[PDB]
Nucleic acid binder design. Structure first.
Ligand code: FES
Ligand SMILES: [K+]
Ligand SMILES: [Mg+2]
Ligand SMILES: [Mg+2]
Ligand SMILES: [Mg+2]
Ligand SMILES: [Mg+2]
Ligand SMILES: [Mg+2]
Ligand SMILES: [Mg+2]
Ligand SMILES: [Mg+2]
Ligand SMILES: [Mg+2]
Lengths: 86, 78, 111, 97, 50, 137, 22, 97, 86, 119, 100
RNA sequence: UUGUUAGGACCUAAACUCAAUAACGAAAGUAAUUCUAGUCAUUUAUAAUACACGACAGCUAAGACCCAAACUGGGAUUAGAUACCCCACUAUGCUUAGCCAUAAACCUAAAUAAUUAAUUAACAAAACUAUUUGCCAGAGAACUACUAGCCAUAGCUUAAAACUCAAAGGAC
C-alpha cells in the first residue's frame, strides 16, 4: 500500500505472447509459495492442525529425497548384464 | 580398529596439497613402482637423517633436489 | 536500602585496577569506562566485590559457601528491585523465591 | 618389535570443512546490497536455507538483518530493489520464462 | 597489558570524538563525504565492491 | 540486447514505448477473479474509469456466473467499451485466484486490446484477519 | 488403541451433568 | 564378528591381517586335504556370477562338485525328495563366497 | 528433547519408504504387485515432473522450445518402465 | 553503552539539513551522551512512503550517529527525536561493532537419522 | 622374509594416499557393448563408457588412464544398519596410455 | 452495494516468507522490530499439610472491537434435521485489575548415575543395573455418594460401599 506499484509480481509480455507471460507469472508465484499461502488462507487452519501438517510434510520430504538418493545410487549398477549365461 | 597412518603420510599430505598428484600416472600393477610423491618422501627422509630440524627447510630443499634430478614439479595452487 | 551503593564515577571491574596505574587518562575516557556508561549488570559486579572484601577472609576465592551466599544476596536484592517495577513478572518472581530458598539452604550448610 | 607398524596420529589428509558464502563475514542491516541477494526479485520473500545454501547461523543472521532493515526504512518489503537486480546470483533458484 | 593497550587506544580515539566546539565543522565534513556500507558476494565467496 | 521481464523501473528513463506512451502511461485493466464472479475494470493512468464488466452484467446467473467462458465474455465486453473510448494497450493487474483469472485476460486479448504486462495483486496478509472456519463435508 | 473406556466415562459425565442441571 | 581379523582401517578401507589369514588358511587347507584324502565329497558354493565359470571349472579340475546356481530351498535339509532315496550329501562345503 | 518430527517419522516410513538394497525389475531398461514398486514409481513421476519442467521453461532444450514455455499437465511412467508418457 | 543511531531525515537543502543535525546531536549531549562519530549515507528514495508529522515522505537523508550514553537515556532520546518535525524515523540500536564476527571452522552436518529420530 | 606390516607400508596403494582425484593406469579386461570394465589395481573394478573418439582402440588388454574418485561406492541410507555397496569403483576414463 | 484510488483517517486485531529451522523456559508456553531489566555456581537423587505458577473455556468490574464466532434469527436439505451447507448477528477471543485451577496439561517415557555383554511376549521408543520418592493390586458401579479444604455455589481437589458380573483389558 505504501510501496511502489508495478514493481512487485509484475511480468512483461514479449512479442504479444500474453499466454507465455501469464504462465511465467504463475511459476513465480507458485515458486515463492504465494499460491499455497493464498489457498490455505481461505479458511482457518487451527494451530494444532498447522503443526501436524508441517511435521508430516517435512518427514515426507525427507523420506522422498532419501528415496531419490537410493534409486539414483542403485541405478548406477543398472546396465547390460556382463555375465550373461552365468 | 587402528587407523593405519605411517609417518610418511605427514610428508605425503603436504606434497599433495602443494603439488597435487604427480603428472605421471600411478601404476598399481607394478609391485615396485616409485611414484613422484614417493621419490619426494624418500629424499625428504634423507635430508632429515642429516639432521635438518625445520620442516620448511626440508620441503624447499627436497624440491630443489628433485629439480636437479629433472622431475617436473608444478606448484599448483589451483 | 543498603549502606553501600557504587558511585557513578567508579570504573568497571575490568579496568578497576588498570586505570589507576595509567599515568594520565582524559575525563571523557574515564566517563566511558565508568559505571555511568555501563549496564546494570556491571554495577552488580562491583557490589559483589565490595561485599566479598568486607566479609570473606580470602576474597580471591568465590567457591566458598560464604562467597556463594554473597553472590545470592546481590542477586536477591537485584530481583527485588526488578519486581518493584514489574509487579506481574512471574518468571522473575520465581527467580526471587528460588534464590531466597537457595540462600537458606547454603546458610544451613554453613551453620 | 616391528618398525613398520602403523603410528597413531590424526588424519594427515583430512579434508577441510566447507564454509558458507558468508562465513566469517559481517552481516549488517545497513548493507542492503548483500541482503537483497537472498530475497525474491518479484515478491521480496526471504529464501530458505535450502535455496540460499547458508548455514543455520548465517541464515538467522541474514533473516534478522532483513527484518531490521525493512522495519527501520532501509530495505523494501514487497519486492527486491531494482538497483540490486544486476548483482551476482548466489541462490539455487531460476525464474525466467 | 591488553587492558592497558585497550585503554590507550580509546584515549587516542577520543581525540577525534565530536564535541560542542567542533560540532558544526564535523557536520559539514560528514555531509561532504558520503559513506557506503553496500557490498556483495559471489558463489565462490569473494567480496564484490562496485 | 535482450527482453527484460522486469518492468521498466519507475522514475528512470527507458527506451520502450507503446503507441508513443511510456510504461507509466498505459491504462490498467483491473481484474478481480473471485470464486463466484469475475469483475473487470479498465482505468486511465490518472485513475479514471473507462470500461467495466463482469459475468453478472453480461447476464450469467448463479453457478454459470463463475465459469471460464463467463469471464471470457466479460473480458470481450470490457475490451469493446474500452476500445471505443480509445484504448489499445493495457497493463493487466489481476487480483484474485478464481476460475476466470486467465479467461478474463484472454477475453481482453480477443477484444482487440494489447496486453504489455501482467501484474498480480492477490491480497496476502502478513500475519491480518482470522479467516472463516473450515467447512465440513 | 480404541477409545471405548473413554466413551463409557463420556456417557457417565454427560448423564451426570444433565442430572445436576435438572 | 570380523573385527578380530582386521589389521586396521587404511583411510576407510579395512585391511585384513595376512598373518591370521596365513594361520587360518593353513588349517582350512589342511582339513580340506584329509577330507579329500579319505574320498569325501567336496562341494564348491558361490553366488558371485563373475566367478561362476571359474569356480565350476575349478571343481571339474579337482574332481569334485560345484553349485554356483540358484540354491533351491531344502537342497540339504530335504535332499531325499529333491535328489532321490539314497543320495549321499557332501562331506565338506567350501564357500568361496 | 522434544522433536516434532518424531510424531510422524514412523508413519511416513511405511508409506514413503521401503527397506533393503533391492531395485525393481521394471526399473531396468529391459507380475506380482508390490508396495515398493508404488514407491519406486511415485518418486520417479515427481522427479520427472520437477525435472521435465526444468527443461521446457529453461533454455537448455532449444530457443524455440524455451520460447514455447510449455507447462505440463502431468507426468506418468509406465509400470513396466518401458517408456514415459509426459 | 555504545549505541548507533539510524536517523532518516526529511529531504531538505544543506543549510537546513546541517541545522537539523546540530539540533539533533545537541539533544544527545543534553541526555548525557558522548558522540563518537557522525556519518552521512546520502539522500535517497525511501523503500516505502513513511508518514511523519502529517506529511508523506518519499525521499529522506540517511545519517548515522555513533555515541555513548547511559542505559536510561536511550528512551528519552528516542522520545525527543520523534517530536522533532525534521525526523522521518529515528532508530537507536546497540552499535554493531561492539558485536564481533564469530569464528567458524566450517559446516559439520547433522545426520538425517538424528533429524527424524531425535533425543 | 618381509613382514606383512612392511609390505603394507611400502605398498603402491598405501603410497597413493586418498584416492580422490588421483591418476592411475588401468587395463581393460571385459567389454559389454560400449561399457568398459577396467582394472586399476584395486579391490573393485570401475565401469566407464567407450569414448566416441578412437572407440576401436579400446579393446581388451588396452591400458588406459583414469582419474579415481572412490575405490568402493557405498552409502548408508536412512534407517539402515550397514552401508549399501554396489561392489564397484568410481573413475573417469581420460584416454589411452601412450605406449612409448 | 460493487470495482479503482501512486487519496485521507485508524493504530483495533493478528505477526507471511524466513521455518526444509529445532532454539528458550519448571511446566504452561514462547518466533514482526528496537531498547531496558533478566536466566548463571547448592556434589547428586529424593517433598507436602507450605509457597509460587499453570493452555483453552468460564466468572467479576471498566474499556476495546478489524475479523472470527457458541447461542439466536433467517434460508436450504431431509420422512424429520433442534445438524452437517448458506447469510446475519451476540456471549466470547483483545486491554487493564481479580478470580477460577481444569486438558488426550500425552515424549501416554519420574529423576539421577552406569553398562552395551557376560539381552527378542507382541507392538511401540533396543536391553538393563543401581539409588530415592510417588503410585498400582479383576471389571463395572465411580471424573459417583458422604467427608474436609477452597474468592470456587449447576465448581475443583480429596474419594468409598452396597450391589452386579466371570470376566474386563493389552498386542498380534
Ligand atoms: S559456515 Fe561458517 S558461518 Fe556459515
Ligand atoms: K500426546
Ligand atoms: Mg454408564
Ligand atoms: Mg435455522
Ligand atoms: Mg462482539
Ligand atoms: Mg487432573
Ligand atoms: Mg502441550
Ligand atoms: Mg473432570
Ligand atoms: Mg465430584
Ligand atoms: Mg463431594
Amino acid at each position: 500500500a505504501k510501496h511502489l506499484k508495478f514493481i512487485a509480481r509484475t511480468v512483461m509480455v514479449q512479442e504479444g505472447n500474453v499466454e507465455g507471460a501469464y504462465r511465467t507469472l504463475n511459476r513465480i508465484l507458485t515458486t515463492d509459495g504465494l499460491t499455497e499461502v493464498i489457498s490455505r488462507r481461505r479458511y482457518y487452519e487451527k494451530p494444532c492442525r498447522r503443526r501436524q501438517r508441517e511435521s508430516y510434510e517435512t518427514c515426507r520430504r525427507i523420506y522422498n529425497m532419501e528415496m531419490a538418493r537410493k534409486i539414483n545410487f542403485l541405478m548406477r549398477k543398472n546396465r547390460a548384464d556382463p555375465w550373461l549365461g552365468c | 580398529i587402528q587407523d593405519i597412518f605411517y609417518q610418511e603420510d605427514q610428508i605425503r599430505a603436504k606434497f599433495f596439497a602443494t603439488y597435487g598428484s604427480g603428472q605421471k600416472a600411478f601404476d598399481l600393477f607394478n609391485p615396485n613402482f616409485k611414484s613422484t610423491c614417493q621419490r619426494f618422501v624418500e629424499k625428504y627422509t634423507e635430508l632429515q637423517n642429516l639432521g635438518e630440524t625445520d620442516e620448511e627447510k626440508l620441503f624447499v630443499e627436497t624440491g630443489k633436489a628433485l629439480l636437479a634430478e629433472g622431475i617436473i614439479l608444478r606448484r599448483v595452487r589451483e | 536500602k543498603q549502606d553501600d551503593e557504587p558511585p557513578s564515577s567508579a570504573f568497571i571491574k575490568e579496568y578497576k585496577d588498570i586505570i589507576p596505574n595509567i599515568e594520565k587518562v582524559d575525563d571523557v575516557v574515564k566517563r566511558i569506562l565508568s559505571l555511568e556508561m555501563a549496564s546494570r549488570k556491571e554495577k552488580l559486579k562491583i557490589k559483589q566485590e565490595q561485599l566479598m572484601n568486607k566479609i570473606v577472609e580470602n576474597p580471591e576465592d568465590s567457591r566458598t559457601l560464604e562467597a556463594q551466599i554473597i553472590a545470592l544476596t546481590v542477586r536477591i536484592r537485584n530481583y527485588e528491585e526488578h519486581m518493584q517495577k514489574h509487579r506481574k513478572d512471574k518468571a522473575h518472581k520465581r527467580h526471587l523465591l528460588m534464590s531466597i530458598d537457595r540462600r537458606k539452604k547454603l546458610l544451613k550448610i554453613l551453620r | 618389535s616391528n618398525e613398520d607398524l602403523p603410528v597413531p596420529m590424526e588424519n594427515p589428509y583430512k579434508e577441510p570443512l566447507k564454509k558458507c558464502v558468508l562465513c566469517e563475514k559481517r552481516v549488517d542491516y545497513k548493507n542492503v546490497q548483500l541482503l537483497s541477494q537472498f530475497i525474491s526479485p518479484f515478491t521480496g520473500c526471504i529464501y530458505g536455507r535450502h535455496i540460499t545454501g547458508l548455514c543455520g547461523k548465517k541464515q538467522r543472521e541474514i533473516t534478522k538483518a532483513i527484518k531490521r532493515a525493512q522495519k527501520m526504512g532501509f530495505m523494501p518489503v514487497t519486492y527486491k530493489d531494482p538497483a540490486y537486480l544486476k548483482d551476482p546470483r548466489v541462490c539455487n533458484i531460476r525464474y525466467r520464462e | 597489558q591488553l587492558k592497558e593497550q585497550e585503554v590507550l587506544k580509546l584515549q587516542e580515539e577520543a581525540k577525534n570524538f565530536i564535541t560542542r566546539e567542533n560540532l558544526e565543522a564535523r557536520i559539514e565534513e560528514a555531509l561532504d563525504s558520503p559513506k557506503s556500507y553496500n557490498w556483495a558476494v559471489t558463489k565462490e565467496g569473494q567480496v564484490v565492491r562496485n | 540486447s535482450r527482453f527484460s521481464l522486469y518492468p521498466p523501473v519507475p522514475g528512470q528513463e527507458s527506451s520502450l514505448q507503446w503507441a508513443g506512451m511510456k510504461f507509466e502511461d498505459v491504462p490498467i485493466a483491473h481484474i478481480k477473479a473471485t470464486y463466484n464472479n469475475t469483475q473487470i475494470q479498465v482505468v486511465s493512468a490518472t485513475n479514471a474509469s473507462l470500461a467495466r464488466a463482469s459475468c453478472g452484467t453480461e447476464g450469467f446467473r448463479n453457478a454459470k456466473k463463475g465459469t471460464g467462458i463467463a469471464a471470457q465474455t466479460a473480458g470481450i465486453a470490457a475490451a469493446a467499451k474500452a476500445t471505443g473510448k480509445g484504448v489499445t494497450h493495457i497493463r493487466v493487474v489481476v487480483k484474485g485466484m478464481g476460475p476466470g483469472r486467465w479467461s478474463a485476460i484472454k477475453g481482453l486479448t480477443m477484444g482487440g486490446l494489447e496486453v504489455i504486462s501482467i501484474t498480480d495483486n492477490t491480497p496476502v496478509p502478513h500475519x491480518g484477519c482470522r479467516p472463516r472456519k473450515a467447512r465440513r463435508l | 488403541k480404541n477409545v471405548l473406556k473413554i466413551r463409557r466415562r463420556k456417557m457417565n459425565h454427560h448423564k451426570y451433568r444433565k442430572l445436576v442441571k435438572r | 564378528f570380523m573385527e578380530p581379523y582386521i589389521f586396521g582401517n587404511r583411510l576407510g578401507q579395512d585391511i585384513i591381517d595376512l598373518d591370521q589369514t596365513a594361520l587360518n588358511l593353513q588349517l582350512a587347507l589342511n582339513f580340506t586335504a584329509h577330507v579329500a584324502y579319505r574320498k569325501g565329497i567336496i562341494l564348491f558354493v558361490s553366488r558371485n556370477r563373475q566367478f561362476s565359470h571359474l569356480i565350476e571349472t575349478t571343481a571339474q579340475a579337482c574332481g569334485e562338485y560345484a553349485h554356483t546356481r540358484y540354491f533351491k530351498g531344502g537342497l540339504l535339509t530335504n535332499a531325499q525328495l529333491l535328489f532321490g532315496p539314497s543320495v549321499r550329501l557332501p562331506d565338506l562345503i567350501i564357500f568361496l563366497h | 528433547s522434544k522433536n516434532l518430527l518424531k510424531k510422524f517419522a514412523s508413519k511416513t516410513r511405511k508409506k514413503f519408504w521401503y527397506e533393503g538394497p533391492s531395485l525393481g525389475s521394471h526399473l531396468t531398461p529391459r507380475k506380482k504387485t508390490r508396495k515398493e514398486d508404488s514407491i519406486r514409481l511415485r518418486v520417479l513421476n515427481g522427479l520427472l515432473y520437477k525435472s521435465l519442467t526444468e527443461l521446457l521453461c529453461t533454455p537448455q532444450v532449444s530457443q524455440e522450445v524455451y520460447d514455447l514455455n510449455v507447462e505440463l499437465s502431468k507426468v506418468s511412467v509406465t509400470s513396466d518402465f518401458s517408456a514415459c508418457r509426459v | 553503552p555504545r549505541y548507533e543511531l539510524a536517523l532518516i531525515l526529511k529531504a531538505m537543502r544543506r543549510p537546513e539539513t546541517a541545522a537539523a543535525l546540530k539540533r539533533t546531536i545537541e539533544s544527545l549531549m543534553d541526555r548525557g551522551a558522548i558522540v563518537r562519530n557522525l556519518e552521512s549515507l546520502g539522500e535517497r528514495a525511501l523503500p516505502y512512503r513513511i508518514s511523519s508529522h502529517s506529511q508523506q515522505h518519499s525521499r529522506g537523508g540517511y545519517f548515522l550517529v555513533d555515541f555513548y550514553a547511559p542505559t536510561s537515556a536511550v528512551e528519552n532520546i528516542l522520545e525527543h527525536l520523534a517530536r522533532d518535525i525534521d525526523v522521518v524515523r529515528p532508530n537507536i540500536v546497540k552499535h554493531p561493532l561492539t558485536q564481533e564476527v564469530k569464528e567458524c571452522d566450517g559446516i559439520v552436518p547433522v545426520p538425517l537419522e538424528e533429524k527424524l529420530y531425535s533425543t | 622374509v618381509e613382514s606383512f606390516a612392511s609390505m603394507l607400508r611400502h605398498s603402491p596403494l598405501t603410497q597413493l594416499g586418498p584416492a580422490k582425484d588421483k591418476l592411475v593406469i588401468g587395463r581393460i579386461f571385459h567389454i559389454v557393448e560400449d561399457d568398459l570394465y577396467i582394472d586399476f589395481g584395486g579391490k573393485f573394478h570401475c565401469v566407464c563408457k567407450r569414448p566416441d573418439v578412437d572407440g576401436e582402440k579400446y579393446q581388451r588388454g588396452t591400458r588406459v588412464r583414469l582419474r579415481l574418485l572412490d575405490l568402493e561406492l557405498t552409502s548408508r541410507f536412512l534407517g539402515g544398519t550397514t552401508d549399501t555397496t554396489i561392489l564397484e569403483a568410481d573413475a573417469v576414463l581420460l584416454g589411452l596410455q601412450e605406449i612409448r
